[PDB]
Structures are given as structure tokens and as C-alpha cells.
Amino acid sequence: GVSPGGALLRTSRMFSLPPVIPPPPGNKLQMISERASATEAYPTHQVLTTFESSRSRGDWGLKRPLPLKSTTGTTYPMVKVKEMDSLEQITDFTSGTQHGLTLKKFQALNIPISTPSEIRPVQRSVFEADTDVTAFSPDEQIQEAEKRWKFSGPWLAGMTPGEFKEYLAKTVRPKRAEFRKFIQKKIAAQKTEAANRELQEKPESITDDEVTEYLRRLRNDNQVLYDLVGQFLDLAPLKPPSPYGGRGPPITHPSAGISYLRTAAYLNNHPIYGPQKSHPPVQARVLKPRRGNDAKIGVAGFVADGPLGSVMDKFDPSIEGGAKLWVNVDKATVDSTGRVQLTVSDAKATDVLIAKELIGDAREPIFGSAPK
Amino acid sequence: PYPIQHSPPNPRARKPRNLFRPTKIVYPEDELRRDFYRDHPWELARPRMIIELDGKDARFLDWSKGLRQRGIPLSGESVVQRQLWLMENQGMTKQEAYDKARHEFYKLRQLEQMERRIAVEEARMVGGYFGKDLLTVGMELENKTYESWKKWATTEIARQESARASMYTNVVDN
């Protein structure tokens, strides 16, 4: 049905570029800066790479070759293309290392992404077959609707007063006729459950006035109706009467495609010291000391809250390259806003010495010159 | 001429304009790519080479086998092509075919990350040493850049305190 030229373009590589996804959502009513913009929470464009023989020529599979001054010399060839050809007849591109290397630095932590917990710490993977599911059947009941993570309806608490009115006017209002049918299908289960439970000692499923009365009966118990309305509009659960309905469901996969490990329950076998007690520590940078009374640390390019415990209390211009702290990444999770939040904890003393020993920074090596 | 119509023209239009204007190329996979990469934003951080070698990639792609094909890397595109195949041949639905190809994609990514860690751990057990990693190289670059900011702040704060104190006309020196 398509010409041989159109058949090649379809399976082409440039045609397989993913569309630019919307940026990570922020406070809608809050002010921002439009001129300047820093790194985003998660990437929105695809990072591109070439062969070393092609990069020297500036060929990146794009319309035109890129300038060599701004694309050669570095170690990791990474580029983000905003427009393959803009109104200035140039390929508006930028470096893609801010996110390309943030992914490699994160995966160097060797930690999975667990489901958000409430405060008995039980880290459960997000790739479990019982929770990580998106295809549901119309017979899918309510008790199993909490395991899902991808809902078609919006989170009512997250919408603004304006977005909620537009939703009520254009999504739920024209679905009244369909909802009445949804009740009739339930009546088919209400008249058969009591009519087929004694046979082991379907209904017409089409009514007009019986539905009007059944809905009135539910006015005394509003909870049983919300579960019936939400199940139809496919709304994410809100309150317990369980799946972390505090901040809402995630706008992406619970892992966000940054890590695919399913557990950290393993021991690192050291060449000389055998297995280790905890995973190797990672050095972090101190940002925004307490003296907001909360501190921020940069671990593998991500910003997280400092350990619950100086260098993190007051700024010190004497320290070269800023204040740095060795820590251990206990848990990593993806909030409902798409951010990756780490629960950092202070690292032990002996561990930091073991890590520094391999790289050649330990002052008193634990091996050889350690009589006690 | 009348350009190729990649999408059906609006039938309700009675006086259509832009008849001699090329139309947008859209495939059934566009809807699928947007779904996957929105559920896996950090999948865009994995660099992908859109540079063509000989244009003969689609000659060895048989998506009836699995996600691992010849010539192309395991990427979000593989899930979309595998999903589209299931959603058309095996009659699965958009969500069902999505979950299947999506789960096959995770188990392969897990082995890739588990192999890096184990490959480095065993190398040291037999006298194998490596260079600096990104965690260390990334921090050193921040140090060198943090210093540049310190010099700027130290030189920029002196401007305000000096210009601030000199704001008053205390030059009389009474």
C-alpha cells in the first residue's frame, strides 16, 4: 500500500526518534524564570551518539553536520536536538551529558527503586507482577485496583479549581448515559448472585426505572458509590476507605526507566576482606547548609536531604571545592511528580577507609600496617 | 500537484484550504512511542545512534521472536515494535500487548546492570584494577567549578559591601 521509499522511511532511524515529552510538572500557580533554565528533573529529549570516526567529521545522522568546536574533544559524545532545522537554518542542539551521565552515575550506585513507604522498613521492588500491571478487565474489582499504577482518570486532589471544572464539564457530564448502562451490568450481577446461589444447593440486564431507585438507596452510604463512580471513570484511589494515596499516583512508571534492578539484598565480596556488611559509600557534596534549617546534599547528580544527624550546619569558604561528605544511599524512590528522591544516610568510618584504600587515598592502610 | 494524503482529509469540510500543501506523516507507532517514553523518561538518557550505516536495518527484523533483533540495540523502539506485532498478529489489546513486551524489556535491562557490577567484582579477585569512575570524575569536575564560583562570589560581594558603605556621603571625615 506504501511505496518502497515510504516503506524505508517508516523503519528509518531518524523516524524512530521519540516525540518530545512534556517537562516534569511543577507548581502551576507558582512563579518561575523564563529566560534561564537549569537541568530538568528527568530528560525530555533523546540523547544522540556517533562513531568516533564520524564525530571528527561532525556527522550525527542529522540534516547537517554539527560544529566541531562544541561537539569534539570531550569523552562521551552526547547531544540533544531541539529542532532538526530551525528558522535560522541551523540545528538547534545542546549537550546531553547533564542527563546522559546522570543516568550512568545513578546506575553506579547499584540500588533498585522501591515503592514509597509510610512512617518496619520493607523495600519491595516496583517490577513485581502483582503491582506492575496496566491491562485490566471490566470484571476487575476494587480490592485489586490499588495494586495498579497507571490510571486513566485524573487525581482530583492534584487538579486546580480550573482544571477540575473543565473536567466536570467535558469528561464526566457527557458520560451520564454510559454510567446508567454500567449500573445495569451490575444489576445483572445483583439478580443472578441471589438467583444462582441456591441452584447448587443471566438477568435481562436492561432496566430504566429500577436504576433510578438503586442509586437513591446508596445516598445513605456514600462510600459504596464513590467506589462505583471511581471504578467507572478510572480514578486513582484517594483515601483508605492504601496504595500511597497521599500525593497521588505516579505520572510515569514507578521506576521511571532509570534503574531496573529488583533488589539490593546482596553482599560485595572484597578481594582481601571477603564479603562486606554494607554497600560501598559514595561521596556527596553539601548544598544549602542548615544555617530553612534543612540541608541539601548532591549524590550522583541528584539533590536529597542530608542525613539525620559541622560541615552541613555553617558555610565555610576555607574548604576547597566546597564541603563533601561520605554517605550511603539506603533507599531510592520516584515520587508522583517524576522526581527521584534518595533517603541518604551517613556512612560508617571503617567503610570510608576501605573504599579510599583501593583508590589510593587511605592514609593508614588497613592492610599491612594495621597491627590493631 | 495534489500531494500524498498520509491521513484522511476532513470530509465535513465544504471549502477546504491548503489542498496543495504536503501533509504530516503519522504512523500507528507514534501513539505507542509517546506512551512508553512518558512512562520511562530516563530511557531517553540512554544514548541512541540515529546515524544510518547502510539503511538495511529492517531486513533482519523479525519481531515474532522477541525484543533482541539483529543490528539494532535493545531500546524503547524494540518495545514499540514488539508491542505493535502482538497487538496486530496475536490480537492482543493495546494494554495487554504493552504489558507483555514491557515485561520482557525489564528482564533484559536487569541482566545488563547486574553484569557490570559482577564483571568488575570478579576482575579484582584475580588482580584486575580499573581507572576512575563517573562518581569520582563527576565530583572532581564539581570541585573545579565550585572554586570558580567561590572566586566570583568573593569578588562580587566586595563590590556590594564597598558600594554600600560608600553610599553615604561620609567623605567629610569629621
Binding site: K288, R291, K314, F315, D316, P317 | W152, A153, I157
Partner: peptide, 21 residues
């Protein structure tokens, strides 16, 4: 102890230059 007060002044000075939250 006054030598500790001037440190608080120098600290807050840099905190003002970090124009980012």
C-alpha cells in the same frame, strides 16, 4: 568570641550569592 560573629556575616554573604533553591 567576637571572632565567631564575623564568620556568621561572611557565611550569610555567600548564601546570598547562591541565587537558587
Amino acid at each position: 568570641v567576637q571572632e565567631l560573629l564575623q564568620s556568621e556575616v561572611t557565611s550569610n554573604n555567600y548564601m546570598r550569592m547562591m541565587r537558587r533553591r
